[PDB]
Nucleic acid binder design. Structure first.
Ligand code: GTP
Ligand code: CL
Ligand code: MN
Ligand code: MN
Ligand code: MN
Ligand code: MN
Ligand code: MN
Ligand code: NA
Ligand code: NA
Ligand code: NA
Length: 326
DNA sequence: CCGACCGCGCATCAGC
DNA sequence: GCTGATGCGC
DNA sequence: GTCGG
């Protein structure tokens, strides 16, 4: 919170560039600046000071000066009063309505929550579910509920087959006291980088979590990635818990460490690490780290027996999950 | 200045 | 049906 | 929008 005013402004700018301008590198540039400012341990007193940080350049330095002086940014005040940008920014908050869809909907006169409900027939399945749970998906998840959810998932998985290992990653693994959603990494010894000896490995887990009325809806589902909705069960006479977003990802068991690194994040932390891995002659995905050739083509996967091994290849001192919240 | 910016699974669409 | 591009949410 | 080269 030391610089919460600045990082909020930059985040609002990033969202503007993503949703309205459809300018993805400006989006990430603003996100990058906001992340580096967010870990800087002094109350920023000027844009000159801010600009010393990697990722804060001249333009962001200017806007920091304006904000530090007036407590506002004219550019944002203008954006806020623009009805089209306003409507687009709102509509994108629905899961499945991206910048493209949102602009299309506004053009057709669909620009409020009321309009969206009136026109359910024009939403695809993902968007229909995002709208259905729009309000619930706004709420955060106390870690205590995350712990309850972990228990249901880990226990229900164990019931399908004792050799499933399910790990909760995401902000939960980084030690967050509240989470936007739940992210689950799934492995099973019959699914390795060398063979898939068992079919329906993910489907069986989804059906099981559905049978016990944990998973209530499905956003998308393939042979290795599920995205949907779940809900803790409520006690006798208790108000119902909010519906929550859940993702489950099945990974080859011999590639667990790149996977848990990849699904622990943060998203910015991954971008930073992967970018630095390129600079040191490697490419990292959620499956492998591979060396780059003189041309650029990736080599064969390098051996990995721990998260730290990946850090070692790229000349990075190890960082605990709790220190990867960028 | 200029070129690169992490890397991927699923849903949907256009084309053959 | 298959292949590739695009949107989307990560 | 920023930064290495
Ligand atoms: N490589 C990469 N990984 C991502 C990206 N976005 C999300 N992830 C991974 O997916 C994990 C879960 O994503 P989210 O649920 O949106 O993020 P989160 O850190 O869990 O935050 P909350 O759920 O809102 O508390 C992240 O921690 C990352 O490990 C991305 O843009 N690139
Ligand atoms: Cl851009
Ligand atoms: Mn999450
Ligand atoms: Mn998630
Ligand atoms: Mn039932
Ligand atoms: Mn609900
Ligand atoms: Mn580096
Ligand atoms: Na800088
Ligand atoms: Na959206
Ligand atoms: Na979220």
């Amino acid at each position: 919170t030391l610089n919460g005013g600045i990082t909020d402004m930059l985040t609002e700018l990033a969202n503007f560039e993503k949703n309205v301008s459809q300018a993805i590198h400006k989006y990430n540039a603003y996100r990058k600046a906001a992340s580096v400012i967010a870990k800087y341990p002094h109350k920023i007193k000027s844009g000159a000071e801010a600009k010393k940080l990697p990722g804060v350049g001249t333009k962001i330095a200017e806007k920091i000066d304006e904000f530090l002086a007036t407590g506002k940014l004219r550019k944002l005040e203008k954006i806020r009063q623009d009805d089209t940008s306003s409507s687009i920014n709102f509509l994108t908050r629905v899961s499945g309505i991206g910048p493209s869809a949102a602009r299309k909907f506004v053009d057709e006169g669909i620009k409020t929550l009321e309009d969206l409900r009136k026109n359910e027939d024009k939403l695809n399945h993902h968007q229909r579910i995002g709208l259905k749970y729009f309000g619930d998906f706004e709420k955060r998840i106390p870690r205590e509920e995350m712990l309850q959810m972990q228990d249901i998932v880990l226990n229900e998985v164990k019931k399908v087959d004792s050799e499933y290992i399910a790990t909760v990653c995401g902000s939960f693994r980084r030690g967050a006291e509240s989470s936007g959603d739940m992210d689950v990494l799934l492995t099973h010894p019959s699914f390795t980088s060398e063979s898939t000896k068992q079919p329906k490995l993910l489907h069986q887990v989804v059906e099981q979590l559905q049978k016990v009325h944990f998973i209530t809806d499905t956003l998308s589902k393939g042979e290795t990635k599920f995205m949907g909705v779940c809900q803790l069960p409520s006690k006798n006479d208790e108000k119902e818990y909010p519906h929550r977003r859940i993702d489950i990802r099945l990974i080859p068991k011999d590639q667990y460490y790149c996977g848990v690194l990849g699904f622990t994040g943060s998203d910015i932390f991954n971008k930073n690490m992967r970018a630095h891995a390129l600079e040191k002659g490697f490419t990292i995905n959620e499956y492998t780290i591979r060396p780059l050739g003189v041309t650029g083509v990736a080599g064969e996967p390098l051996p990995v027996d721990s998260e730290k091994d990946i850090f070692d290849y790229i000349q990075w001192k190890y960082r605990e999950p709790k220190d990867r919240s960028e």
